[PDB]
């Protein structure tokens, strides 16, 4: 239980970054709508939020299942690897986030 | 900026874009195990 | 990392190159002045 | 005087700027000799520095020469010029060190 109200709790907290990258996207392109590049970066980066709100409903839905209750490895397994995932994705924003912010600056 | 730049952010972009859809399809798949 | 980025900052190197080429021309031609 | 001393002030500032960029090539190339880029990168600040060292001596010399004294117009728009790629080239050094900072970490 524990670990996948942090996993979620991660995952929102990266929604939140999403969201401060995103607001940082419009601030630039409402500057430039010349390029479609970055009307390409902003509809990525919100197709991203929509499956990033959608896993958070999913798993939404599996917790509180789960807190209706009191095979439990292969659950902890995938938990490993959407960690590892997300630190993945974690690591991919941040490098944006600077290439973002040399652009902008 | 030098469209070099702003390719490879286009690629993290992508590259974000397939880590999330593998997140998902085990989200959907561990909902359905 | 990506060599798109990297070929930007040799690109942003050869510009400072080039601006310092022109401080050294006009420092040299204007002790000579 | 004080624009002489101010502008070569703000030589020898970027060249300190630039002498710290060249410790942190040697870092990062010392890890990688495997890549002639940064060989690259390595020699051409190397270049820069050295052609920074000679200005710096050229006006040096001009500058105690001058002292040396108690036709200016050509002299303070050259002072404009320099100051104005001078600019040009410090931020040259930090989008610079800006994507530096991005391939490092």
Redesign the interface.
Known sequence: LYKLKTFLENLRRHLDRLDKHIKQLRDILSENPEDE?VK??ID??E??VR??K??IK??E??VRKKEKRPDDK??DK?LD??EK??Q??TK??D??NK??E??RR | ?????????????????K??????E???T??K?
Chains 1, 4 share one sequence.
């Open positions: 590049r390409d970066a990525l980066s197709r991203s499956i990033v959608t896993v999913i798993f839905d599996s292969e659950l995938l690897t959407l995932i997300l993945t994705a991919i924003i490098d944006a290439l973002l040399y652009l | 900026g030098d469209p070099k730049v702003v390719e490879t952010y286009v690629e993290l972009l992508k590259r974000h874009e880590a999330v859809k593998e997140l998902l085990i989200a959907k561990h909902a195990k």
